[PDB]
From a paper:
Class 1 Pgbs are distinguished by a weak hexacoordination (KH ≈ 2) compared to Class 2 Pgbs (KH ≈ 100).
The imposed substitution did not affect the overall tertiary structure, but led to significantly faster autoxidation rates and a minor increase in thermal stability. However, the overall 3D structures were very similar. In the WT, this helix starts with a Glu residue, while, in the mutant, the helix seems shorter and starts two positions downstream with a Ser residue. As a result, the direction of the side-chains has different orientations as clearly observed in the proximal His, which is almost in a perpendicular position compared to the proximal His in the WT. Even though this possibility cannot be dismissed for BvPgb1.2, it is evident that the substituted cysteine did not contribute to increased monomer content. Thus, since the oxidative state of Cys86Ala is pushed toward the inactive ferric state, fewer radicals are formed in the reaction with the peroxide, ultimately leading to less activation of the possible substrates in the peroxidase reaction.
Residue numbers in the entry:
A (entry chain A): 7 to 52, 60 to 160
B (entry chain B): 8 to 51, 60 to 91, 96 to 161
The structure:
C-alpha cells in the first residue's frame, strides 16, 4: 500500500512529543476503552494503575508509530520472527473481535487529540488511523491464518 | 429501586429533548458506527433512515423506563426485544457502546445540562432497560 512521507512525519513527530507522557497516556487510553466498552476488562486477567494495562497500552502506541515507518519504507507492516505468530496467537486466544480493535482505534485517536491539542489535523488522524489499520490488518491476517 | 430524584432528572431532561428527538437519533447511531463500524453489519443510502426510528426507540424506551422504575420498580414487546437482538447477535459490547454514544448525545449534543447525577440517571435507566432485554435474550438454549 501507499503511505506518504508527510503521513509518516505526522505520526513520528507527534509520537516524539508523546514519548515522555507515554505512561500517563497509556492509562488514559484504557480509561476511554473501559469507559466505552467495560466488558473489555474481562479479556485482561490483571490495582487501578496496573502496570501491564499500561504496558499493553504502551505497545499499542509504539507499534503503531513503528508501523508508519514500515508503511513508508516498504509499503507494508513487517513483523519479526516468533513475533507475528505471537501477536495472532494471543489476540485469538482471548477472543479479540473487530469491535475491540475499532473501539481501541477510537480511543487512541481521542488520546492523541487531547494530548497534543495544537498538532492534530484532519490530516493527522488519517496518518495515525491508516498506521493503526494496517497494523490491525497484519494482526488479523495472522489470526485468520489458522486454517 | 430507582429514586424519585433520579426519575425527575430523566423526565425533565427528556421533555426538553422531545422536539429534537429526530436528529438526536441520527446522532446516536453516527457515534455508534464511528466507534464500532462493524455494528452496521447487524443492520441492513443511510442519510435519513429507519436507523433514526430505531435510535428513536432507544431514546423513547429509555425515558419510559425511568418513569416505570420509579412508579413500579420494573421495566414494562419484551419477548420481541429479546428475540430480535438474540437473532442478530447483539453482545454486551454493543449495548455499552450504544450507552456511551447515548450519554454523549445527552450531555454533549444539543442538551447542554449535565451533572454527576444526570449522567447516572440516564445510565441506570438505560442499564435496567438493557438488563430486561438481556434477561429475555438468555431465552436461548443455554
Ligand atoms: C494495534 C493494536 C494492538 C497491538 C499492537 C497489541 C499488542 C499486544 C502486545 C504486544 C501484547 C503482549 C503479548 C505478550 O506479552 O505475550 C498483547 C497482548 C494482549 N492484548 Fe493486544 N494489542 C492490540 C490490540 C488489542 C485489543 C483491541 C485488545 C482487546 C481489547 C487486546 C487485548 C490483549 C490481551 C487480552 C492480551 C494478553 C494480555 C495477557 O496476556 O494477560 N489487544 N497485545
Ligand atoms: C445496544 C445495541 C443494539 C443493537 C446493536 C441493536 C440492533 C438491532 C437490530 C439489528 C435490530 C433488527 C432490525 C430489523 O431487522 O428490522 C433491532 C431491532 C429493534 N431494536 Fe435494537 N439494538 C440495540 C439496542 C436496542 C435498544 C437499547 C433498544 C431500546 C430499548 C432497541 C430497540 C429495538 C426495537 C424496538 C427493535 C424492533 C425492530 C422491529 O421490530 O422491526 N434496540 N435492534
Amino acid at each position: 500500500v501507499i503511505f506518504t512521507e508527510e503521513q509518516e512525519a505526522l505520526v513520528v513527530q507527534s509520537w516524539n512529543v508523546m514519548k515522555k507522557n507515554s505512561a500517563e497516556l497509556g492509562l488514559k487510553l484504557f480509561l476511554k476503552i473501559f469507559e466505552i466498552a467495560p466488558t473489555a476488562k474481562k479479556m485482561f486477567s490483571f490495582l487501578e494503575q496496573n502496570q501491564k494495562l499500561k504496558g499493553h497500552a504502551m505497545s499499542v502506541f509504539v507499534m503503531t508509530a513503528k508501523s508508519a515507518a514500515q508503511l513508508r519504507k516498504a509499503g507494508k507492516v513487517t513483523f519479526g520472527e516468533s513475533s507475528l505468530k505471537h501477536m495472532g496467537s494471543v489476540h485469538l486466544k482471548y477472543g479479540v473481535v473487530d469491535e475491540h480493535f475499532e473501539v481501541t482505534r477510537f480511543a487512541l485517536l481521542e488520546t492523541i487529540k487531547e494530548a497534543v491539542p495544537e498538532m492534530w489535523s484532519p490530516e493527522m488522524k488519517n496518518a495515525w488511523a491508516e498506521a493503526f489499520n494496517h497494523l490491525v490488518a497484519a494482526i488479523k491476517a495472522e489470526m485468520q491464518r489458522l486454517s
